[PDB]
RNA sequence: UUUAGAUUUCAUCUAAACGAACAAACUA
RNA sequence: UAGUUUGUUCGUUUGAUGAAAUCUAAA
């Protein structure tokens, strides 16, 4: 089976997600909110933050994938346009990551199976943990596959260590969060390039993942630079920041932002609330009064960033560096002066 | 069975009202409107003019009664608070006639059967045209019953000649619209008084229903007054009106309003758009510029009104008159001078 | 008193407009609508079509002026900014004519009396029918005054015969709809120019107001021109219209449109629904299939238009003619060829 | 170009439709309504009756086609999924007839030109009146083309004599409303079948288009049957209607409905307000009390319907008839007895 | 009296709630929000989160009860349908706790006094700290009464120590928050069953209320089990939790969630956001990746839960155990092998 | 018509075991 | 081809809940 509003709310009340049970409950739809009648009074079940209708969004939210799914930025960078027989929820913007669906909700479905002729020119996302999806990927034209194990005849591309589980990004211990990504374009199995993966952390809950990051969050600016021989790579401005002018200087890695927030809190106005490899913020340091309207921030592994920046040439006045990060190319604006770097920030 | 939004919408799309079939259709709920996707584009099915939530009101409208039911004013004067296993629609305000239901909608249900203890202090409306409802009325504590035929052991009260059929009031020819009303209060079958019934007409679609009304619409004022010996009863101002001052005079029967409308169109602003025995309108005569803010109109049969007014006494300066109209008492303000009438407007 | 939502709704329920009575009724504000509970069910009182809040517009509409008031276009052309101690409802757009009030509603009041200093750089509209406003007008700095009679020391200007009474524009018989307009700017009593007045009619209820208009709606085009010696003034195209090409020609008077609508109905799309001396319509003729996007239509009296067009000189190729209509200058684009007129349409 | 809400509203205010000029006006968006500030007060320009956002719907409504375009149902039957560089407005449901656009609005555009790769698996509607579109139709894969004249190398199909102009269905006299339809499928020029075209009339504005229709609207039932020898085809119930029982019988042509409406008005509750070759109405006769929930009505030409029905065989108990009407197959359920007919309702 | 949106907003602006003062202010209603104009600009007074009209919900919210009142779960469990001459606000869902009112709001009133015949088949909640409300309880047919002290001729039932003061549950010191509950059904006084009371705590502000809870938050799992002789009662799973497999095991007491949260924060999704004895959560362990779609959590005192689980019979394969908590029966599902408990989890919701 | 009890069938249950099937990881 | 771990599905163990149906008893 029954595709209806009240069965979905039944499953939400009784199981927390649309599991497929049978039964119905009272439902009220007022404004963009879905209420239900429990003990004679109306309890809100879902408030619609999306641009879909209320019941469409409520049904999509209830049928969201509760397994560990890849982060939305990885799926966007791989070019995924639609997901086969599942809804992938974007908790950053409280909406589905993809506009249409395949065999999920009648209002959004462009097909009931990924093998129809309308899904052919679209990179479908196939979940190899679900039985029967690997063969669909094999017969598909454009698609992306993730698998915990190995698939015969296909060279795996090992993905990021972390994945989103119910909106929480974690490196799984009780569950596998590291999948092998296979991408097929026009019936030709492409090999994904060797990439770096961003760590997906945040300022408040920042935990270092390497001894170098521990040294960064622990040692002083001079001690850390001297210890790792980072002289002449402008780490004082690239990572630590410059809180002395009216405009904030540098600070284009999340680890430096976390260190500053530990020293003195500030304000990050994420004026585009979406998940991506490179984020822009509106920072305003509350102590010095130094603010910058746009600050491009990418949360690489500090060891990986060191490896990248030490593999460059400080010979030209400026150079744009192409690096594959999260299965996509990121262009870095390098401005290296004679023997030093004036600035090096993502664009 | 299934009670859900999409089954209701399937029934509405396929049959125009909820019949009880099985099936579902895609449905969008935006603002107070229910849309369905037909041929790939969204077609509006219902716009909520009520104060209920959209899906509640949509279900109630889908499950409205399609058989000829008594007019809402008759039920209100009979004190009906709720209906048994049916929904009665007030087409004047595009909202259900009663606040709660019995065994129709999960959200508005106070009970599933009219014999539950919660329904005992409520005058339920039983429809004798449906089987088993007469036995429910006998087993009810407080209830009102209508019957096309006769019920054993109960004294009928002959109701009005017309009934409402999908918002169209008519005197049914192919179908019966004259019902016998039975009322029971605290388990005691009470006999309703002898009453006069309002004809429930309008100005634009006005048709006379007696010889006297035909004379009124055709003969002049003096000819009509002389022919029916209506001298000494202020029929010039009470019925025809006075379009000579800045404030309109009299005009308290729908027949004279219709005569004027045939003479000259004007404006009737019904500031309380609901069905009742006595209606107040904001008249603005577009020809003479005479407007009256509040003007009570009661659409009686002219013969019955003549009988009532000739059953009066022209002795006192003023008197309040009690007339049972539509199973309820109507208070008439009669300002009559010595042997003549100054004015006569319902209160 | 008491200024409250429930008292306003009490007056609307009991009298149709805010009369100043004392009392309160239950009210519910859902969407942009105000509902009141009568006989246990909610009856809608006011649906908000304006851009004000619901209670604000409900209070303004209840306190609207129900006497014969000047039409909105006359007050606009006179530069009226606000009305003193009254609310003038613009029924064309179902919203107040003026953005603020003086001593009406706390949410819009810029003052409680028109004598305050904030009202000084504003043309306030004073109603001479309300006692005391003429003295206020004399003491005012900028203002407009209407008087049924005469005001000592001020030369009256005769306004149009018709006036708006509850949204119905009428020439009063039992009420006076003709006023004397006075204007004062910077404390200086200005004299209004001699003007022609548009009759403010419509196609559907079009009634001629002179013998010349009677002949127009009766005689043929060639007979009418010959009888009134309208040869050489392009009355075939200016007035009657040219339903022959894909683009409609001329038809810049309401009387010709009314003649055609009597001959054959069409569609007038008023894409700027507001009261103005010159109206632009989107004509689409349903018989000939000729549609014009913008067709400026001015509802002059036919005799006055003839008096206008016979005061012209048919010598220049093109001319912009200034005619003061409704207290404002209206620019006519006149194209006249050798001895004739090519076109003559309002700008 | 400039693509902005203010430029669109400037074009709408100055010209009534988006012509392509330059300028901006103040704009407000409250609820689903767009207002503009004319003379200091807000004037509503557009009320969104669609499911799209307000500004998207406003931009589409402004950019609608104001030339005579084919009726919507023809485009649906031909399988049109999108229109190239134009917007076709479905005035029955006050929304665009196609969900996406090409080169119109950035919010709905799936492509900027109809030649992109995403447009290939879609039947694009090309108008030959716009220069350069025939070359596009030749190189398109799936498409439909209309032309006033003829195209070299393509065999035309003569279209219906009526085309919709600004929501007015008319037979063009000053302009051409008859196009030649060319349809291509998968790069292959398909030939459209010979079809009978519905007239698209209405009850109130019903005008006969043949002498037979004149006789139907003038002669009585028996006289019309006798004159045209329509015995043995059950024209008494098929067209004239059966207002004798509680349920309406037959009445599946618009001509009989119009005749009855002339005799006595009734209700047409169009529960699905959209344009199609066959329409269903919820009829409730106000005079006799006869109401039918579903009544499938097709407005064929009476001569064409006579030609079709006299080509049938009255020898079977039941039969399904495939009649190509408006470029689509219509199934007719003919329950005819031995020389008589039980019922004949289109499906 | 005056009953109007402008007088109500005047009281809100001047005094915070509805005190019954006289006066008015300019009020604007846009969306589900009530705005008031202070110094030429509009200020948001109240955003409507309910299913009621904005002005109705604003009038109810203004006239809410500011004294310590019982938590809404206690009133639901005792069966209260309506409140006499007061509004009980549900801060867990920002809406009135009861559908209709008695003598409060003309739009929601079913009666102006609880003695009318429409209030007879409803358990009207009667306060005792408002004079004359006890005698209304005695004349009532169905109702619930609370009292700080004693009522002559009635047997008190001592209720929970905590009460909700303006949405803050607290064991009062300056103001008394322990009431005596009296229930009356069909005109007959009913003795309430002896119950345990959930402590109404939360994860972030968790404070132990007994020595056993201090030991639980301080000691290790094995040390605690050995000290309190809880071997064989599945305390490793029922209370502590089992973050080893893909689906979370156990963790049915709020104190265990508190210990885990202090060790390592996780996510609770309240997919039915209301107030009840047993809460269902969508727990996702942010550390191990362990999750559970429905995880029934009850906030009993640890000593009381130990007392409950030590009085079960560990013989049957399974048994549904009915425990009276907050004046209602809570069904605990008991699975136990021979001499050891497999699991014991609440089920409600 | 209302209520209580008994019986048949279906779905569910925040634990485990068993058997089956599929897939991945370790191994022979 | 076989043993162990993990994930998905089906059925059994144990008590109960809700629904559809049947019968009995009481008012």
Residue numbers in the entry:
A (entry chain C), B (entry chain E), C (entry chain D), D (entry chain F): -1 to 345
E (entry chain A): -1 to 347
Would you copy out the relevant sentences from the publication that reported this structure?
In coronaviruses, Nsp15 is a homohexamer with features that are well-conserved across viral species and variants. Additionally, prior structural data of Nsp15-bound dsRNA shows that Nsp15 utilizes a base flipping mechanism to cleave dsRNA8.
By utilizing a dsRNA substrate containing one highly preferred unpaired U (same as in Fig. 2) and a catalytically inactive Nsp15 mutant (H235A), we were able to circumvent these challenges and build a sequence-defined model of Nsp15-bound dsRNA via cryo-EM. Our final map has a resolution of 3.24 Å, with many regions reaching a local resolution of 3.0 Å. Nsp15 makes close contact with the dsRNA via a number of amino acid residues in the endoU domain of protomer P1, with a few supporting contacts in protomers P2 and P4, in agreement with previous structures that show dsRNA engages with a particular groove formed by three protomers of Nsp158,44. Y343 uses its aromatic ring to stabilize the flipped U while using its hydroxyl group to form a weak H-bond with the 2′OH of the residue 5′ of the U (C13). W333 is intercalated into the dsRNA helix, stacking with the base 3′ of the flipped U (A15) and the closest complimentary base (U-21), which is in agreement with previously published structures. Hydrophobic residues are clustered around the edge of the endoU domain, forming a plug that shields the hydrophobic core of the dsRNA around the flipped base from solvent.
